[PDB]
Amino acid sequence: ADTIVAVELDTYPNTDIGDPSYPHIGIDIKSVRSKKTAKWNMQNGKVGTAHIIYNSVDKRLSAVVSYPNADSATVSYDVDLDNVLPEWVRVGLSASTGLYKETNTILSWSFTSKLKSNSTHETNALHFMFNQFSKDQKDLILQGDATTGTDGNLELTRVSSNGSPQGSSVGRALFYAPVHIWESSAVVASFEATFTFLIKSPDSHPADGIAFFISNIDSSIPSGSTGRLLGLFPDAN
Amino acid sequence: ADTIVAVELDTYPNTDIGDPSYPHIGIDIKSVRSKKTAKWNMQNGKVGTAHIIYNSVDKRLSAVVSYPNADSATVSYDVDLDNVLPEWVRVGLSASTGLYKETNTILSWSFTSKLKSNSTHETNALHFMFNQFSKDQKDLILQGDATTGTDGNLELTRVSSNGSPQGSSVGRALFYAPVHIWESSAVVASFEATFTFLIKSPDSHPADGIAFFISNIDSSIPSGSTGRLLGLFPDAN
Amino acid sequence: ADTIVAVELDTYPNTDIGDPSYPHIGIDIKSVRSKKTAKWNMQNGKVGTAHIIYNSVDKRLSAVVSYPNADSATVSYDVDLDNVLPEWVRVGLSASTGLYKETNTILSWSFTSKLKSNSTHETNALHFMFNQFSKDQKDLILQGDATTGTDGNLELTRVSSNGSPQGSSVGRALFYAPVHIWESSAVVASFEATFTFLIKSPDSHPADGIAFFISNIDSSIPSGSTGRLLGLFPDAN
Amino acid sequence: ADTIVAVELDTYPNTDIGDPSYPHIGIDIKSVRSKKTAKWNMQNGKVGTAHIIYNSVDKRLSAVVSYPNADSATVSYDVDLDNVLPEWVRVGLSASTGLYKETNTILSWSFTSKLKSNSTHETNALHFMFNQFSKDQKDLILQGDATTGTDGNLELTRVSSNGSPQGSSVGRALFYAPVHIWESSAVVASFEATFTFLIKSPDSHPADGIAFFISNIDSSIPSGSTGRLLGLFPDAN
Numbered sequence: 001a002d003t004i005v006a007v008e009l010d011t012y013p014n015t016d017i018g019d020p021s022y023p024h025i026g027i028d029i030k031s032v033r034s035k036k037t038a039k040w041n042m043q044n045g046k047v048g049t050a051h052i053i054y055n056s057v058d059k060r061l062s063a064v065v066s067y068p069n070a071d072s073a074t075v076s077y078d079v080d081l082d083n084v085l086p087e088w089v090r091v092g093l094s095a096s097t098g099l100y101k102e103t104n105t106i107l108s109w110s111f112t113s114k115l116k117s118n119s120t121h122e123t124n125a126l127h128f129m130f131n132q133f134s135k136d137q138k139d140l141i142l143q144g145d146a147t148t149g150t151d152g153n154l155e156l157t158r159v160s161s162n163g164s165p166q167g168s169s170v171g172r173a174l175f176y177a178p179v180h181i182w183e184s185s186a187v188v189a190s191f192e193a194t195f196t197f198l199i200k201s202p203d204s205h206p207a208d209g210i211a212f213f214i215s216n217i218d219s220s221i222p223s224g225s226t227g228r229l230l231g232l233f234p235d236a237n
Numbered sequence: 238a239d240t241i242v243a244v245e246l247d248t249y250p251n252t253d254i255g256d257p258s259y260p261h262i263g264i265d266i267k268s269v270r271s272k273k274t275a276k277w278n279m280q281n282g283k284v285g286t287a288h289i290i291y292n293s294v295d296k297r298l299s300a301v302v303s304y305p306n307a308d309s310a311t312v313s314y315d316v317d318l319d320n321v322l323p324e325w326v327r328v329g330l331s332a333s334t335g336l337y338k339e340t341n342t343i344l345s346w347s348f349t350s351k352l353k354s355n356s357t358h359e360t361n362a363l364h365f366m367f368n369q370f371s372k373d374q375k376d377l378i379l380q381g382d383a384t385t386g387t388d389g390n391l392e393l394t395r396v397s398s399n400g401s402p403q404g405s406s407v408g409r410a411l412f413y414a415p416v417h418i419w420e421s422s423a424v425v426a427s428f429e430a431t432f433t434f435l436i437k438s439p440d441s442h443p444a445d446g447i448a449f450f451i452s453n454i455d456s457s458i459p460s461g462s463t464g465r466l467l468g469l470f471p472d473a474n
Numbered sequence: 475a476d477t478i479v480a481v482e483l484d485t486y487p488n489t490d491i492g493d494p495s496y497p498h499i500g501i502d503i504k505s506v507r508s509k510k511t512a513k514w515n516m517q518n519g520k521v522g523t524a525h526i527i528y529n530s531v532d533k534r535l536s537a538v539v540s541y542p543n544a545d546s547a548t549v550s551y552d553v554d555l556d557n558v559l560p561e562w563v564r565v566g567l568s569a570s571t572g573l574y575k576e577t578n579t580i581l582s583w584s585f586t587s588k589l590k591s592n593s594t595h596e597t598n599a600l601h602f603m604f605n606q607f608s609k610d611q612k613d614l615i616l617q618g619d620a621t622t623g624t625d626g627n628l629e630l631t632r633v634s635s636n637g638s639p640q641g642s643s644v645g646r647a648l649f650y651a652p653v654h655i656w657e658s659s660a661v662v663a664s665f666e667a668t669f670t671f672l673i674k675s676p677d678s679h680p681a682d683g684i685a686f687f688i689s690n691i692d693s694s695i696p697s698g699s700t701g702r703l704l705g706l707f708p709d710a711n
Numbered sequence: 712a713d714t715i716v717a718v719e720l721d722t723y724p725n726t727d728i729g730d731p732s733y734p735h736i737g738i739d740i741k742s743v744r745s746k747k748t749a750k751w752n753m754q755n756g757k758v759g760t761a762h763i764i765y766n767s768v769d770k771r772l773s774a775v776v777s778y779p780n781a782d783s784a785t786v787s788y789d790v791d792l793d794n795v796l797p798e799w800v801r802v803g804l805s806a807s808t809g810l811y812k813e814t815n816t817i818l819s820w821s822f823t824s825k826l827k828s829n830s831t832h833e834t835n836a837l838h839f840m841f842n843q844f845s846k847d848q849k850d851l852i853l854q855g856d857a858t859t860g861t862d863g864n865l866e867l868t869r870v871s872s873n874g875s876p877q878g879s880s881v882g883r884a885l886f887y888a889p890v891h892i893w894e895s896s897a898v899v900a901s902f903e904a905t906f907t908f909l910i911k912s913p914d915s916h917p918a919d920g921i922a923f924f925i926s927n928i929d930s931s932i933p934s935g936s937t938g939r940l941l942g943l944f945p946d947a948n
């Protein structure tokens with residue numbers, strides 16, 4: 001199977017696979033069963049912002065999610081990504097719905113990776129920023145139900161013309177260029193990602209959520225990864 | 238044929254195809270016959286730096302090349318790149334040798350593109366920076382004789398193990414992700430590129446040169462584009 | 475007197491000092507009588523964005539102003555800023571009102587300056603970005619009526635508690651650090667500025683406007699520079 | 712006294728004030744007696760590079776120092792800088808000599824600070840980069856023996872015309888603009904610094920070292936802070 005590291009914004013509590021009894025943010029290392037979670041006071045229909053940070057010196061993956069006029073949620077996990085991920089990866093966003101549903105709308109997405117070697121003035125870097133998505137966005141790989149250009153947004157899961165989110169949907173966007181997160185001369189490797197999102201549901205129980213993920217470069221949506229598996233995992237192990 | 242916009246660092250004067258009688262920097266719009274040139278006091282065996290800038294408001298492509306402890310050469314040309322290039326492009330470096338030869342070594346390469354729309358806080362951006370090239374650089378497309386990872390450099394043309402440059406060589410490196418240089422809501426589009434290079438020849442007459450270029454995304458080395466055609470053009474029209 | 479280079483967003487036509495008969499954007503070199511102007515379809519009560527760009531190779535100062543869902547206005551002027559400004563400057567925003575009035579509210583302001591020398595990998599750079607202004611913003615020099623921290627904005631001119639703009643007001647904000655825009659080894663010097671603004675008036679005839687400016691480091695508001703003089707000039711010469 | 716947070720590159724072991732028996736990198740929180748140290752294989756006469764990173768989510772100050780062709784040294788310390796430093800600070804470099812001496816030459820220095828609030832698209836940022844220092848560098852505050860512009864470098868301590876380092880010297884450079892490292896709406900605050908340095912001594916025992924530091928904005932060199940106190944502390948408590 002693929003190798004996945006993800007930060008989940010998990011809108012539906014699946015307590016049978018170890019979710020807490022509430023919407024939560026989590027850090028997923030090769031499993032949907034988050035290694036660490038925090039309570040998330042998700043706001044139906046409001047624009048939120050998520051920040052993800054990591055560096056190879058501290059080996060700590062951290063994330064913060066907030067809405068305007070509200071307190072943040074934060075989660076951290078100690079993990080050496082050089083022991084989990086290959087040296088070249090792709091980065092992306094994933095989302096799903098199941099019998100319960102929501103919009104999984106991405107309004108902006110930025111990413112920076114840096115690899116600093118012991119050579120004098122020797123940083124390698126990649127940065128991208130999308131504030132508007134176009135109908136034919138050639139620097140994104142869209143998978144499953146993901147589409148771009150409707151109001152300049154990335155719709156990770158299926159939405160009707162009238163704007164109703166559909167059930168049993170899964171979709172992903174990956175940046176086209178591979179990202180280098182380890183090199184033998186590297187003294188520090190870091191990355192940061194930010195995305196803004198709008199999760200709206202006509203229902204009291206939205207599902208299933210959005211994730212930022214890092215994967216092997218050839219990652220594809222696993223078979224049957226609608227609903228609680230967030231487009232990331234083939235099963236709940 | 239491909240569509241090419243390039244800044245050439247032209248080490249060998251081909252006066253029969255309109256080069257001036259000296260090494261020169263030039264701006265090439267869909268032809269090896271530069272629309273504008275400036276005299277370039279090329280230094281055999283020294284590390285040089287080239288800077289290329291453009292924006293869609295001024296519609297002027299400019300370049301500056303320098304060496305430490307020396308005066309710069311500069312060239313500019315008024316051109317609307319939205320009338321020359323497609324809306325999605327790839328960017329890259331090209332170099333060639335012919336019967337006369339030189340190393341075409343790239344020590345670093347950085348690039349930034351920005352597309353700002355009339356949406357409040359709506360920039361799209363791409364930035365990359367290579368200060369060290371690795372043996373298997375997955376975010377570069379290498380064409381022809383180009384190789385990476387020898388002393389952390391990009392060798393655009395063939396060099397022996399003993400470091401001797403070879404004749405009749407052509408090679409290109411392109412960044413893997415397409416670049417968006419026009420969008421219908423854009424109020425300003427810009428890019429900048431920088432590269433550092435080492436051109437060394439055992440001969441009094443080095444050839445043929447290095448170019449930074451922008452192309453259709455599917456660009457490949459034209460047949461017979463060794464020597465004076467710099468890996469960019471199928472003929473001298 | 476001070477030395478001033480400015481891009482004006484001029485909301486009130488003073489045809490006696492050479493304004494065109496309409497709101498306009500202009501480039502001001504040591505005079506309120508703009509060297510170049512363009513018609514500006516100013517929108518009372520809407521958030522606008524202005525972009526200013528310059529580099530020392532092309533020696534062209536350009537600006538673009540837009541609102542969402544509207545066409546942009548643009549103006550350019552050929553000028554060698556190394557012949558107008560000292561090598562060290564301060565950058566800032568200025569605004570004024572007179573007998574006619576408006577809010578001169580700044581919601582965000584960013585600035586980047588770069589000085590690249592002929593030394594290998596030798597850029598000097600300054601970048602700042604304000605998306606929220608605080609009540610005691612120590613990296614800004616406020617002059618005249620300018621205040622910060624009301625709704626996280628910079629109010630360049632006086633506004634009552636009920637939000638009514640006041641007449642006969644002038645105010646400026648300058649970034650605290652001086653900016654280096656020339657050095658003897660520089661091969662290219664550039665800057666870019668962006669700001670977002672909200673000009674609102676209860677009146678059919680708002681005045682007087684907002685400017686981005688570059689000045690000698692010790693610049694202060696000239697005596698009597700309310701109204702048409704935009705906080706920048708001591709007279710209309 | 713001032714409030715100081717510093718990363719020390721400590722070239723001389725003062726075992727009486729808790730240094731280990733070897734050159735070391737350390738994290739100093741309001742004391743020269745480092746809270747954490749790591750062995751540093753300092754290279755007399757070689758150019759080194761130091762990297763310092765921090766963020767408010769992980770509350771961990773980390774540093775890495777390396778030379779080309781050598782293994783790095785790294786040190787980390789868990790500390791909430793919002794409990795140590797004021798909300799506005801200055802950042803700088805410090806160095807000293809005593810009866811033992813060395814050059815404390817800075818070849819480049821860069822710094823980035825970011826404060827992200829819970830407002831949609833609301834980052835405040837400061838970035839500067841010096842690759843060449845000029846004789847009259849108006850965006851630096853020089854203290855004590857520090858000078859700029861000799862070969863484009865910052866000499867933190869006294870060096871003769873023939874290049875001999877002098878004993879009993881102390882000097883500091885601070886960036887002119889205050890830096891905002893806390894705000895009540897901040898969800899994440901971070902900074903990174905990099906500097907390149909050349910420590911050369913005619914002696915087998917160089918002293919005393921270089922530090923990157925963060926201070927109250929009005930910080931000055933403490934009386935008697937030559938030698939082991941690195942220009943940072945009034946005593947060895």
Ligand SMILES: [Ca+2]
Pocket residue numbers: 010011012013014019208228
């Ligand atoms: Ca769940």
Ligand SMILES: [Ca+2]
Pocket residue numbers: 247248249250251256445465
């Ligand atoms: Ca030629």
Ligand SMILES: [Ca+2]
Pocket residue numbers: 484485486487488493682702
């Ligand atoms: Ca006017």
Ligand SMILES: [Ca+2]
Pocket residue numbers: 721722723724725730919939
């Ligand atoms: Ca010591």
Ligand SMILES: [Mn+2]
Pocket residue numbers: 008010019020024026032034
């Ligand atoms: Mn979960």
Ligand SMILES: [Mn+2]
Pocket residue numbers: 245247256257261263269271
């Ligand atoms: Mn030519």
Ligand SMILES: [Mn+2]
Pocket residue numbers: 482484493494498500506508
């Ligand atoms: Mn005017």
Ligand SMILES: [Mn+2]
Pocket residue numbers: 719721730731735737743745
């Ligand atoms: Mn120590």
